[PDB]
Each structure stands twice: as structure tokens, then as C-alpha cells.
């Protein structure tokens, strides 16, 4: 699990990798003064409270996460994220770079990779928030590697929603233009006849908290 | 269209091909099988109950060549039936993994108790190989006593030849025969039981050998 | 017992919830204002005491909790949700949210798919009860995957359970309309001719805490 | 040792079960206030001291246990259930619910069955006694999988014994003819012309303590 | 330049090339094959029907060599077409490696069955195995027809021979060649099967069977 | 209905079908084989102290033919027997698993001694393995004398031969066939005698592989 | 001087050697293979569309005669040729050891390929193993022909045969040599494919199977 | 009933049946080998000052004979012995079991020299392996020698054949023959010698190859 | 991991040794009273950010590091670097010889390559600074392995780079010369036709703090 194969390879992350890949499609991107998530949602069964176990999970009032994978070993890394977050704000008054928050979750991601008698987590993850350098957007692999991103995916249709967001992505766009931008990246990542059920969007600007778009919200972009 | 192409297959033969031929093969097939084995028992004791002379290496007798006829018949009968069961299987091995194999690994069992049906027990394949044709009779056993009996016969006709053994191997050909389908028959009729209950208990996996929808992942 | 394999899976965890599959069948389902858990079991002797079997256990006074597979493990977890649950309640002096709760036993199993020199528990449990959100109902498998459901099922008889519920379940029905519903849904998993014995059956509304139907109350519904 | 099967059973759990198949049989049964169990001794070579290394032991003055497996495990598990009685009356100043003891015991067995570095205890047992509820008689697994019973057994003879109780058994019986019953359901997993030599008997009623028969009341059954 | 002349080979022979031999296999050779049968069949009641004389040696039957013809150029075609398949498969086996073999596995596990049409169920081979041939009869069956019955005309023609059973053996070689090809039909059509199967549930990795590009490296 | 094909099959061949042919074995089958061994070594030595000319050329001795009929017949009762607990562990295999498999192993284990019994104590088979034939004489050990003796027969009677140790070979001829009945029986007795200790140690797990009901889980 | 006899060795055939055929097969020897098959599928209609009178067996056919030893000349050929490319590989085998063996796995398995084509695919061999022969026609096929053929062809001119299915198997052996040309033509077309394919992705581990500087010791 | 008929079998073949074997091995049996190996060097001195003609084809040589037919009858004895120690071992053959077989491997491996001596050593079967035949002759080695020694008599009487060395052949045959019985003496001199030992060795795990009754339980 | 093949090596070290081979390549080169460094970056896309996850990482003020291999790995010895940088400043004031902060990280290297239950990291570094000695150049390698240089490169154009350096290299360059030389030397290991994007540059003379050449000043060069 912590072995380099003849060719410098660690199978198992790159098996935990491919579990990231089953997970739903969920992207985020800055925008003029802000970012935003959206995260597709297969919901299944009308049996299901649609309410909760949501996909966009607030770490504090300015960072959000979203994840794909393993659901399970996704929460424990919320929690870790959230209670990291907290430290933070408890030694220093407030979270000054997100970029520090980041590093702390991929470094308790890397040690799952380096170290015997455990399995890496099968999960990635983008937080998107607002620190004191400005809007961000990073993403999180099963390896612990980090990235910061302008506009980026994770889940089945990763590869679909970048190829369009590479064509059509433009810096700087008004909120309304690039949740319609976004909603229609994850749309160029269904099968077509497949339809777009109900996603979850959030977004914050800068001197605000996140704002969770409502239900009706979403629908106007649908 | 590339899934249309493998449903095409699918829906041509279905698990209602494989089992129509399982019901065949536990009524009809073994009485028929039944019937072969006490016409070749019938044919054996008129056999033992016999001298022979040059009138009888001068004839070939029709009863024999009957009995192996019908036993020519049932055998291509089962290879043809044993074929629609190793189609049904084959379409559906997955897709090749080094993973989640349990399934395959059933298909694999059955292929593999049905080729040897098909090869070993009814002695199709034009040759057989180092493992030798452990059954007593293939499915040409009417062209083998034929020619088994044809040099006899030639022999003895040419005066033919003097021998009083060759004269008791012409009868002996006749009654070794009969032998043959006593034994193939009981020999094959355990194979057909065999694979019938190996069918009905693993026809699922058979059919879908991966049930593959986790709820770990979102 | 915690090794990915080439496409992302998890075997031991996979094969924990065969276990899950051969217990009895249980169900969960809302309705106006409550929620209610009805268990089947198969007591085979007639030497067996009924009345000290151990199936729908409470966990506070309004929450409670059914179980399936190994149940020694399950023991064990509706242990730890019990203490779990307590320890919450000294140090706020309350439960708000029975969402925390599930998260926590969910946690402890995850964990037992992540460590080494451990095996994964082989159960899948329901919580149901009121909070201050209302009335809930989670779902919560060996892998630490949690739901919140309008309906849901566990045990050797959950298809045709969730099948059933799926084309006849609905919202905000009386008590006696939900229970009579559920004893429906339950028998529909049997064999045929086979007869339902009595299931036990629990319920709980706003305001209220549990009750446990007994033995006779039961009867009514067969 | 702690894996899961692809079908989702733990084998070295199930061969434990084979090592408590091997021992010498035991039953126990309820009768009208009371409890009493019967373990066959199957002593040979007069060179042993017949009265030593009973089979029946009290693990407090009301509460009794009879075992069936590896004998050194066994011995290991009743000390631990003594000292485990202990400590609840220390605490509480008495043991009002044996099921609770019974659990506890069930505990320590399921931890063997999930963490690596141990096997199970190739032991099962039955514990019989009298707590604030009634007269109590539970059985317990290598899986610390437990039950309560009107009657049950143990050991080699384990089904014909069950099998004849399961027709013999009547209810609340006085206690000689509940003995009687008891010999009789021990004779009858005996093979052909095989002859039961004196077992440990033991009982308890409501408001006494447990009294061991000695060897000449048992005797007097034979 | 190396990658060049990969990439001729590669662009010669593409996905398109063997797709386009499934895409037939699938329609026309199923059904081609199904027709081989039928005809085998019919020409086989006939020669059930029959008496045999002298005559029946002085003439090699017409009927029989067309359906064995038949069958000889259907093989040929199979043959031609499976070698499509190989070489779109082989020219695609990737650099030697211990690991990162998973695509590498379909690639051999596929050529595998394709041999076995082409080894096995074609008998397309000089000589066989020890093995043996366990097809019912092979792509050089007018040969094999031809010999088995020239060798018994011959004996028949001359004085010929006096055997009864040497002129039933005539006859039994017309109706179990015929046989034979009904049999290697029908077998052949499971094969056939089976590999559109396999091809079509694993072909991306026969084209592609190594995804290599790290995130975890820089 | 799927259990009742298997339950029929079950019902027809029970562990009592079984016992019964072991039961023969134990008692009837040891006296008669005794009996056939008995009968050879008398046979050779007549044969022994005896001279040769070419008046056994012309005649087949029948004591001799006696005792290889007397052995076929018993190599085909065995052989016939041995299929009757061969169907009744076979249809009694099963559903296939990847895990509780020890009762599965029992019954593959028996059943390989019984094949060992049918393929190559009774050379049943009509071609054996690249193992060859251990036994020293088979099922059709009648057709394989008349065969050698005749070649014999006809080089004597001609113009005969006047090879003074082509003579000696008929005589051994004689002589070997009643050894290879001495040495064969011997050899049959053994595995008869495992074959009843075998299916009579482990008969329980032969009609019941696995038994299967767990606690565990409710 | 050791070092200097394996520096001569390694000097004589180099990288550049093997890659020349490696050329050299891409192109010339391909179009080549693809003229041999269009002569052999020429020279196969023409006998498709011929009776065969006693005419026939009197003159052996000039155009058969030259597509085999066409053939012949381009297997002796890709033989060669391979040889080199075998001898690149080989006399860079490196010191025997239990580790660093991944360049020298490569080696071993590039090396099979080619023993492969040289002994299966080109039937080089005087006796071919246990897996017999599963080309289409070797390495001597000219001599297997007219082998066949003039057995044929004497036993048909005188006195001679009237066996009219003898008559259509001379025509059979020039039909069937041509066909197994044009099978053996497409398999050989594989297997360099094959090759090639493998050469240019394997070279620099075929040549340097080790690289090992370690910064680790001093 | 069950274990009465076990017991039956082993009270019938006990160890003191195979250690009599063995007692009997060790002194007379030995003894009986040097014997015939003395016999055999002696008439293989006689032929080596012999110079041949054609009365030497006239006669078979009874003296070579006798040796011949003693070599017979003890590979007899020996096979026959062999089969009382088979059956001692197997008829102990414990329960099938994935466990407690170490006393299981004393008893094969015990059973495996035994078969090497019957089947190896003694070339007791009808048809030898693709392990060939070790003996230099076998239990078959008279009738080896007639029908070798008959070829040639055939040859040289007729007008029969000029050939210098077909005489010397004769000749050869007879040397041979006798060199073969003091080489195949030997070797079954050890053989022998080898089972003396390993019987000795092992004779208790043979017998009762589990002592199973642990304290552990109760 | 820890483990020696017959012929005394380190397979599993070796192994990362590989990995370290697909990092993108940077170099180091001491000139006139100073020390640079010079990284290439392999950029995705113009999605990704720019501003960050730099491959030139500040140690302290007079002492950087770049690397190649692992990026989660490298990440982490980059944090333990600074700290034992910091850790040395506190105990005794100030960093006298920067080859004893290098030898603790390689320490930290090998000690992965000797216990069990661990890899290796897959990271090479080179470090570049000023210290008491003057400028210093050291490279260090999954083993712990350390050299220092006056010129040196690693990643996957480290043969390149060397060989160029190794006909151009000069000592005491000034500083425009010595970047100079370095973007040549980086270009000739870049594939035919390849287009040198615009790499990190930094450099440190005496008496200063490091610098960071911003985009236009790297402009120069390209």
C-alpha cells in the first residue's frame, strides 16, 4: 500500500483513484470577486430525504467543500477539515490562506499512502472559499496533491466538464453568467437523452458568507 | 452499435434455450438412452447364443448396425443440445478482469464439465489426445465396426484364411460392439445426470455472473 | 482487510454486507408527525424465551435502532450508540440532531474498513426517533455509508421490502394506516405460503416517547 | 481469523464451533421458581480424582455456568465471568439483571472474532441462575452470540438432546420431575447400549441459593 | 524513424478493420455457416435413404462435395478475417513490462480464443497437438473425404472385394462426413459467438491497454 | 421446476443404490473374481507342461475362452456398478463455490478412485492416455487374444512357417493370456477392496458435502 | 582477452543489424508475402474451374510447382533474418543473476516471439513437438506436395485405378496447396507484424537489459 | 453393516500378511533373482562362443527358454506379493481430510514405490507410459523373445535371406535376450531391497497412520 | 522495503529512484558570490493557477529548495525542513553551515529506507543558499544520499541538463550569465521543437536575502 512498484508507482493510490472516478460530477470557478460549487446529484429512490447528506459542505462561513469517492472516508475528511479549520481560527484569530487548510487535509491524505497497516482514502475533494489573498479554488487527491484552480472538476464526467470549461471558460464573469456556464459544462458531461435533476450550487464575493442557492434558485438555471 | 450487437446475441439464446434442453435431457434424452442400452443387451445375448461360419462373415447383420445407428443418433442429438448450453454460457463471460470472478469461475466449471460431455463422452472430435477416448464408443462407433469387421470379413473370404481364432473374432467384433453401447450408454447416461444438476444448480451465475452496484461511492 | 482493489473496490467491506444480507428483514417508514421500526424474526424452538429477544433496541427514550446481520457485532454497536448517545446528552444536556449520533457509530465503522488487523463490522443498522428537526430515519451499512430515508429495509427481505414500499409508501399517513402498510410490506418478502408470525413493532411521535406495541397489540395487525 | 468469506461467514469462528462439538454434553432447563443443568461428566480411567475438575461451575451463589469446548479456554472465560460478577456488585451492590453478565462474557468472545493478532475461544456455554427478573438460562457462542431459553444444550449430544426436549419439554415442572425429564433427554443422545454414568447436577430456586447434588442424589435418577 | 513505422502498422490496421470483421461475423457468417448446416443435413437424409451398389463406387458423389466445398471456403474466410483480429490485437501489445498488465491480460486472453477458432476449431494446422482435433472435422475436409473414400472404392472396384460390410463403410463415410459437417457447424457457430462476445465487451482495452499519466509526479 | 428435476434425480439414486453395489462388492464380486483366478491358473498349467505342433493352429482352445468370457463379463457388472455410485455423488456436487469445500473435495477424491476403477483397472476406455495401460489385460481381452492368436494361426497354416519359435508363441500366446487373468483379477481385487473402504469411510460427505445453517446472522 | 571476444561478438551484430530486418520486414518483406498470396489465389481459381482426366497425373503443374517455391524462398529468407535479430538479442544476455532481470524478462520474451515464427509459424524444424504443426503449411512444403501428389499420380497412372474420388483428390492436393499458401501467407503477415511491433517498442532493453549506476555506495 | 464390513477387509489383510511378504523378500526372494541372473550369465557365455548358421534358426534354444520362463514366474510371484502389501495400505486409507494426513503421506509414498516396482520394475502392463519402460525386459519377456527370435528364423529359412548380419542378428537376439535378464535381475534386486526398507521404516503410520484423540476437549 | 537483494542493494530505493525520474527538471548552479536555481513547470492548462504550488520553495531567507518526484512527499520534506531550520535558529541563534540542515532531511530519507512499515519518499531536492562557508549547492535523494555541487539538475531532464553543464559550465559567472547558461542548459534537454515556456528563476548573492525573478524579469532570458 506504501510500495513503489519497478516503474516508481504506488498502485495503491492509483486504485483509490479509481474509486474517486465513480463518484458524481461536481466542479467549481472563480468568478468576478467570487467562486462557486455545483455538484451533480444522482438521488435515486423517491423512498430518500432528498434534505440532507448534502454533496457542498460548508467547512466554515467562507469555505466550502465538495467531494467524490468514497462517501464515508469523504465525511471523516470533512470533519478533519472542519475541526482543522477550527485550530486555525483558535491559534491565530482567523484563517488567514485556505491554502494552509488544504495542505493540512492532503498531508493526513499522504501519510495514508506512506505508512503500513492502512489503506489511503478513496476520495477527492475541491474547497472553494474566500481568504485574506482573495477567492479560491483547490483541489485534493487520493496522494495528498493539491492544485489551484481557476475552474475544475472531480467525479465521473471530470474530463467532459474541463474540456468545456478549457473552450469556454472566461475570467471575471458576472455571478448569473458563470452558474449558467457551469450548469451547462455539467450538462456536456451527461449521456445525451440523460436529463439534469436538481443540483446543488453555492457561491460566495468577497466581504460576504456562502450563500447555498435554494431549490427554486437552481431551477431558474435548469 | 456495439451493445446492440451483444443483446442481439443475448436475446437469440437465452436461458429458456439452455434449460428447454436441461428438461429434454432429464425425460426423453435418458429413456432414449434406456431403450439403446437394453436393444444393445438384446442384440449381445442372440450373439452369445451363436457359431459361426463363413455364412455369417458373408452378411452384415442388420441388428447390430441398428442399434449403433440409434446410438449415432442420440449422440449427435446430445452434442447439438450440449452446444445450445456452451452458447448460452460463452455470451455471457464478462468482460475479461482480474477481479470479481466468482461467477466466471462457475461459467468456467460448467464449460468445462460440458466439453468433456462433448469430447470425451461422445467422442466427436476427430482425433483425441494424449489423455486417450476413455469412453467405450465414440459417435462414429458404426464406421469403426464396419471397418473392424470389414478386414475380418475379407480375410476370411479372400478360400480366405484357415484361422479358427479369426472366425471367433468375427463374432467376438460383433458382441464387443454391442458391449460398447451397453457401456457408453450407462457411461454417458451419469454424464447427462451429472450436468443436469450441475445446470439447475449454478444456471444463475451461469446467466449473470456479476451483480455489480456498490453504494460506497458517490 | 482494507485494500483497494484495480477498480476501487473494497472486497472485505463487500463481503461484510453478505453478511448483512442473511439476517431478518426489518423496516423503518415515517408517517404523520412519527416514525415507527417493525422487525420480523425467525424463532425457530418453541425452547427459545420470546420477550428477551434482543431485536429493535432503544437507545435514549426517542431513539431506537434495528439490526442486521452478525449480532454479536450488532450488539456491540447498539452498545456504543447507546454510550455514544449519553455522553452527548452530559455534555449539552441534550441531543439536537440524531444525525450526529448515526455519524458516530457510521465513524467507528469506517475506521474498521481503513486500519489494519481489524475486520469490518458485518452489520447494517436503522436509527429512528424525533429530534429538534422532527422525525428521522437513517440508514447505516458496514462501510459506514449513512442515508436519511421516508421509508427503508434491512435483512434477507429488503428488496422486495423497499419494492413494494417504493410502489405503496406514502407521506403523512395516520399511525394505524403506516403499521398496517409496513405488515404489508413485510409479509410481501415471505415465501409462499408462509405465514407471518408476529413481528415486533415500535413507534414514536412529537411530543411523545417510544412505545413498544406488545405482543397482543401486535396481533391486531396479522 | 477476522476475514469475511466472499459469502460472508468467518471461518475460524465456524471452526471453533467444531472444537464445541467435540465436548461432553450439558443442558439446562426451567421448572416451576427454578432452574437447574445437568452436564454428562464422560470420566475414564479410575487413576482421575472423579469430583475435581467439574464441569459445572458456580460463578456466583446464584448464578451458574456449564461449558462445552476447549477446556483451558473455558476455565479462562468463567474466571473472567467471576471476576466480571464482582465488579458489578462492587459498583451496584448486586447484579440484578444476569443478562448483562451473560453480555459482557458475549463481549469479550465477539472482540477475538474482528481484531487480528488472536483466535476465538473454541467454547461454548451455558449460564443458568436466578436475578431480580426470575429464573434465567442463556446460551452463549465463540461468536459471543447468545440466546435465552425455556431449556438448551451444548456439546457432542447437542441436537438429540434439543430434539427430544423440543417434544418432551413441559413447562413450569416441579423440580424432581424436571431433573427426571433432564436424564432422560441426556440418555437419549447416547449411543446404542451406552450407559450414562452418574453427571454433575445442580439447582436453584427463587429465594435460595444453588445447591450441587452429590454423587448419591444423583444416583438415585439412574 | 521507430514511432513511425509503429504508427504505419497501427494506421493500416485499426479498430475499424477488425469491428468490420465482427460486424460480419455477427450477420452474414452466422448465417452462412447455419446454411452449411441445413445443407449437410439434407444431404445427409438422402444418403440415410440409400442402398448402396457398386455404382455408388464408380461415381464420387456431387452433392457431398458441394456442401464439403462449402464448408472449406466458409473456413477460409473465418480463417482470413480472424487474422484481422490478430493483427489489430498484436501490433497494440504494449512495451514489455511487470506491471501495469491488466489491458495486457484481454489483449492475450482475447488471441487466446481466437487461436482456438483458428487452431482448434478451424484445424487449420498441418498436424495437430497431443490435444488432438476435437472438432468433428476440419478445413481440409474435401481431402480428407476424398482419401477416406478413395481408399474404399479401390477395394471395392478391384476382382473387388466379396465384404458386406467393406460396401455399408462406403456408405457410412458419405453419411458421417456430412455429419461431421453439421457437428464443426454447429460448434463453429459457438465459437464464432463467443469471440463477437469477448471483442465487443473488451475491445477498448485491445486498442488501448494502458492508461499512463500521473497527477502524483512532478 | 428446477428443484424438483434435481430432487427426481436425487429420489432415483439414492445412498442405498450405492451401499447395495458395495454391499455386492464385499461378498459376491471377491468370490467370483477368486473364482476367475482359479479358473486361469489351472489353465496354465495345462498349457505349461504340453508340447506344440500345428494341431493347435488349428483349433482355439475353449477352456481358454472361458475364462477371458468369464472375465469380460465381470469387468462389465464392475464397470456397470461402478457407474451407479458415480451418478450418485455426481448429481449430489454442489453449487460451485470459491469456499466450503471440504465435503467437494471428498467427493472428487472418490470419485477419482472409481475412475482409476472404470479407465484403467478395467481398460474400459477404447483408447487409453499418454500413461498408457497399466493394467495387464482389459475389457476386451477376448478380442485382443483372438486377434494375437489368429496372426499366429494363419502364419502356420500358411505354406506355414517353419520358424521353430514362431510355434513356441502360439503355446505362449496360450500360456500369457491365462497369466495377464491371474495378474489382472489380483490387481482388480486391490482396487475393489479400497474402493469399499473408501466410499464406506466417507459416505456421509459424499451424499452430504456441506452442512449449512449459521447463527451468526439473524 | 574475455572482454575483448564479447566486444567482437557485440561489434559484429549490432542494434543496427536487427533493425535493418526490422526494416526490411516492414516494407519489402510484406509486399513480397502479399505477391506470394495474390499468385496462390490466382493459381487456386484456375484449379477451381478444372476437371482433372488421367491427363492430369501425367504432367505435374509448372505454376503450383513455382508459387511453393516462391513461398519456400521467402520463409528461408525471414529465417535468416530472424537468426540475426536472434543473435542480437542473445549475445547480449547479461551475467546470470537472481536480481535486475526486468531489461532481461524483456529479452526472454522478445526471443520467444521469434522462436515462435521460426519454429511454428515457418515449420523450420525436421519433427515438430507435442503441439504439432498449427501452420497452414512449413518450411518444405514443395516436397510435402509432390509427396502427396505422386503417390496419387502412380497410383492413377499405371493398370491403374478406377477410384473416381482418387481422380478428384489429385485435384484436391493442387486445390488445398495453393489454399494453405494463401493461409500460411496471412499468418506469416501476422506474426512479423508482430515483431515488429515488438522489436521497436522493446529495442532499448533488447540491447541495455541493464542500466545500474548506483549513487547509493562509495 | 459398515464398520463390520471394514473390519472384515482388514481382518482378512493384516500387517503380519504384508510383513510376511517382506520376510519372504528379504531371504528366498532374493535369493531366487541370483539365481536366474546366474543362469542367465552362464547362457550368455554359451552364446558368446558360438558361431552361427542356419541351424541355429532350425531350434529354439531351451536353455534360453528356461532361463526366460524362470524370470517369468518370479516377476509373478513378486507382482502378486506386491498386491497383499497394496492392499494392506489401501484398505487403511483414512477418511478424506484437508488435515492430519502426514501418516495419509507415509502411506502413498509407500504406495507409489510399490507401483513403480508392479508397473516400472516388473513391465506388468499390456501398454507402457510416455515414461517409456525402465526394464530392461519385462513380465512379458518369453513372448518378447519368440516373436523377435521368430522374425528373423522367418527371414533366413525361406528361399530366405543372404544377409551376413541377419545371422549374426539371430545371434544377437539370443545374447541379448540373456543380458537383458541379468541386467533386469539386478535392477529388481534393488528395487526389492528399496521396499524392505521403506516397509520396515513405516510399517506403523501404514497401518495406523492417524492416533487421533486429543486431551483438549470436554 | 528495508530489504537487501544478494547483491547488497536496495530494490525498494531504487524504486522510488523512478519516480523521482518523471518530475519536471531543475537545476542549481553556484556563480560570482551567489547561487541560483532554475525550475521548469509542467503546466497543464490555463485553467490551472499560476501564482502557486510553486516549485521553488523558500527554506528560511537565505535558503531554498526545489524538487522532483512525489509532489505530496516533496511537500512534506519541504515542511520538515523549514521546522528543523527554525529549530536549529532557536537553539543557537542562527544556521551557521547549511549541510547539517540537509543532512537532517536526508536522515529523515533514510531512516524510510531501514525501518519496516514505511516507503521511501519518491522526492530528489536540491538545496541552494548562503551560509557562514558561503554559497552552497547540495542535491539529496530518496537513500539520503547527499552531494554538494557547483552545478547540478534533477527530474527528467537531469542527463540533459548535466551533460550541457558539464561542456558549459563555468565558475564565478556573473549573475545574468549564470541564468543565461541555466535557460540553455534547460532548453537542451527539451524535446525537438519543444517551446521553453518561462520557468522559476532565484537567486541569492552574499550579503542578501533571496530573490524571486517575477514573470517580465524571467522574460528576458526566454
Redesign the interface.
Same mark, same amino acid.
Given at each position: =500500500?506504501?510500495? +513503489? !512498484?519497478?516503474?516508481?508507482?504506488? +498502485? &495503491?493510490?492509483? @486504485?483509490?483513484?479509481?474509486? *474517486?472516478? %465513480?463518484?458524481?460530477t461536481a466542479l467549481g470557478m472563480k468568478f468576478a470577486n467570487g467562486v462557486l460549487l455545483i455538484s451533480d446529484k %444522482?438521488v435515486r429512490?423517491?423512498?430518500? $430525504?432528498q #434534505? !440532507?447528506?448534502e454533496?457542498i459542505q460548508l467547512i466554515d462561513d467562507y469555505v466550502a467543500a465538495v467531494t467524490?469517492? /468514497?462517501?464515508?472516508?469523504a465525511? *471523516?475528511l470533512v470533519?478533519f477539515a472542519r475541526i482543522s479549520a477550527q485550530q486555525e481560527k483558535v491559534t491565530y484569530g482567523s484563517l488567514v490562506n485556505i491554502e494552509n487548510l488544504v %495542505?493540512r487535509v492532503?498531508?493526513q491524505?499522504?501519510q495514508?499512502? &506512506?505508512?503500513?497497516? *492502512?489503506?489511503? @482514502?478513496?476520495v477527492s475533494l475541491i474547497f472553494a472559499g474566500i481568504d485574506q489573498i482573495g477567492p479560491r479554488?483547490f483541489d485534493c487527491?487520493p496522494?495528498?496533491? =493539491? #492544485?489551484? @484552480? %481557476?475552474?475544475?472538476a472531480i467525479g465521473s464526467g471530470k474530463d467532459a466538464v *474541463?474540456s468545456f /470549461? $478549457?473552450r469556454e471558460?472566461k475570467e471575471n464573469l458576472p455571478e448569473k453568467e458563470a452558474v449558467t456556464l457551469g450548469i451547462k459544462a455539467l450538462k456536456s458531461s451527461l449521456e445525451e437523452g440523460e436529463e439534469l435533476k436538481a443540483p446543488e450550487i453555492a457561491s460566495i464575493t468577497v466581504g460576504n458568507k456562502y450563500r447555498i442557492y435554494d431549490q427554486e434558485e437552481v431551477k431558474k438555471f435548469l | 452499435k456495439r451493445a446492440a450487437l451483444i443483446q442481439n446475441l443475448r436475446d437469440s439464446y437465452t436461458e429458456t434455450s439452455s434449460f428447454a434442453v436441461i428438461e429434454e435431457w432429464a425425460a426423453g434424452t435418458l429413456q432414449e438412452i434406456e431403450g439403446i442400452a437394453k436393444a444393445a443387451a438384446e442384440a449381445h445375448g442372440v450373439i452369445r447364443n451363436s457359431t459361426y461360419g463363413r455364412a455369417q462373415a458373408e452378411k452384415s447383420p442388420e441388428q447390430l448396425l441398428g442399434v449403433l445407428q440409434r446410438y449415432q443418433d442420440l449422440c449427435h442429438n446430445v452434442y447439438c443440445q450440449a452446444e445450445t448450453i456452451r452458447t448460452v454460457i460463452a455470451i455471457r463471460i464478462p468482460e475479461h478482469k482480474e477481479e470479481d470472478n466468482l461467477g466466471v469461475a462457475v461459467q468456467h466449471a460448467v464449460l468445462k464439465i460440458i466439453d468433456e460431455l462433448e469430447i470425451k463422452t461422445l467422442g466427436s472430435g476427430e482425433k483425441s489426445g494424449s489423455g486417450g477416448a476413455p469412453t467405450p464408443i465414440g459417435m462414429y462407433a458404426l464406421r469403426e465396426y464396419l471397418s473392424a469387421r470389414s478386414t475380418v470379413e475379407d480375410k476370411l473370404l479372400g478360400g480366405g484364411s484357415q484361422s479358427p481364432s479369426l472366425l471367433l473374432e468375427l463374432r467376438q467384433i460383433d458382441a464387443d460392439f454391442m458391449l460398447k453401447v451397453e457401456l457408453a450408454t450407462t457411461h454417458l447416461s451419469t454424464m447427462v445426470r451429472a450436468v443436469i444438476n450441475a445446470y439447475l444448480l449454478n444456471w444463475k451465475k451461469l446467466i449473470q455472473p456479476r451483480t455489480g452496484s456498490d453504494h460506497m461511492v458517490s
Open positions: =500500500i506504501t510500495v +513503489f !512498484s519497478p516503474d516508481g508507482r504506488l +498502485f &495503491q493510490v492509483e @486504485y483509490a483513484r479509481e474509486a *474517486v472516478k %465513480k463518484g458524481s %444522482k429512490s423517491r423512498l430518500i $430525504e #434534505n !440532507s447528506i454533496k467524490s469517492g /468514497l462517501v464515508a472516508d465525511r *471523516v470533519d %495542505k492532503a498531508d491524505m499522504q495514508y499512502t &506512506q505508512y503500513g497497516g *492502512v489503506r489511503p @482514502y478513496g479554488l487527491d496522494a495528498g496533491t =493539491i #492544485n489551484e @484552480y %481557476k475552474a475544475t *474541463v /470549461l $478549457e471558460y | -
